[PDB]
């Protein structure tokens, strides 16, 4: 047979991991294979953060970063080296790897904003430049729909006028994330540093409607446009990944059209695979 063969296999298919929807882990794993294609584009090359709920989202769950011995072989993997030590992380690049994901009850995958990067003569895979931003605008107390909309529509303007294109995602959670191809891939505390340069902006443009800090006080009835996930210490849940939440809810590209519904909502799994079919990837040009 052939050494490098990718091969899972599912068990406990009916173990229930959403009590509220009865959503199983058979339906994760279709759902994963749903998914891979219009998923794999834009996980490619970077470390995947789990977060894996064993016995469902009623029960304890934990992050796993470094990829354990246990996991299968043939997974693609390379190493940070970081402040403390060093992590060697998973990257999921085939149907098979997130069929993995769904069978370690990895309902979340998370990702940072580059990739990993081979070097010319060694080929070793190194972390490399940032290939897009990536903003989390993250509703206050009481901020509408329309409010949040208006937000994210203020940020795509913004990066326009710097001649990129804006991506809206919602998290699939209480927010909404918005993704951008850099033209040129920058270090990622280049990226940070632009990043917060555009939310400052927004921010003294709409100081109203509009916060670029953390600080608590300062948050009701305005958007936090979260600029510091860019850091490359940081991760974002994947688009396409499930959410460990009461329902099966996802990180679901969108339309900007959509985004003008007072009516929108976050989007579960069973919708995710509808538009698929109906639209493709709307994340087509995010990536690659
Ligand atoms: N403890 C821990 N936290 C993490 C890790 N990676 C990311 N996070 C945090 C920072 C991210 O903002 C967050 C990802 O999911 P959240 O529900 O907290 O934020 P998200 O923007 O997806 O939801 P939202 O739209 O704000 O409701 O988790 C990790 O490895 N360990
Ligand atoms: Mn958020």
């Known amino acids: 047979g052939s ?3 990718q091969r899972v296999t599912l068990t406990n298919a009916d173990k229930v991991l959403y009590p ?4 199983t882990k058979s339906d994760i794993f279709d759902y ?7 998923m794999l584009g834009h996980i490619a ?10 016995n469902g989202v009623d029960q304890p769950a934990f992050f796993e970063k470094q990829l354990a011995l246990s996991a299968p072989p043939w997974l693609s993997r390379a190493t ?3 402040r403390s030590g060093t992590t060697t992380y998973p990257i999921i690049d085939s149907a098979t790897g997130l069929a993995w994901i769904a069978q370690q009850a990895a309902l979340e995958v998370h990702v940072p904003q580059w990739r990993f990067v081979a070097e010319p003569g060694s080929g070793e895979l190194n972390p490399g430049p940032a290939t897009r931003l990536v903003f989390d605008l993250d509703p206050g107390e009481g901020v509408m729909m329309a409010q949040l909309a208006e937000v994210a529509r203020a940020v795509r303007d913004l990066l326009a006028d710097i001649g990129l294109v804006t991506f809206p995602v919602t998290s699939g959670s209480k927010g ?5 191809p850099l033209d040129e891939p920058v270090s990622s505390r280049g990226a940070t540093v632009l990043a917060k340069r555009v939310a400052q902006r927004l921010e003294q443009a709409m100081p109203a409607l509009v916060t670029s800090t953390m600080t608590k006080s300062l948050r009701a009835g305005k958007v936090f446009v979260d600029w510091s996930q860019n850091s490359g210490s940081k991760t974002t849940i994947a688009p396409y990944s499930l959410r460990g939440r009461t329902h099966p809810t996802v990180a679901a590209p969108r339309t900007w059209a959509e985004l003008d519904d007072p009516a929108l909502r976050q989007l ?4 995710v695979l509808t538009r698929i079919a109906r639209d493709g990837d709307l994340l087509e040009r995010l990536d690659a």
Request: charged fraction near 20%.
């Open 20 to 23: 509220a929807t009865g959503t």
């Open 3 to 5: 050494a490098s063969e």
């Open 32 to 38: 994963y294979a749903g998914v891979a294609e219009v």
């Open 268 to 271: 579960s799994y069973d919708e």
């Open 176 to 180: 909404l994330h918005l993704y951008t």
């Open 80 to 82: 940070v080296a970081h």
């Open 45 to 54: 090359g970077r470390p995947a953060t789990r977060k894996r709920w064993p």
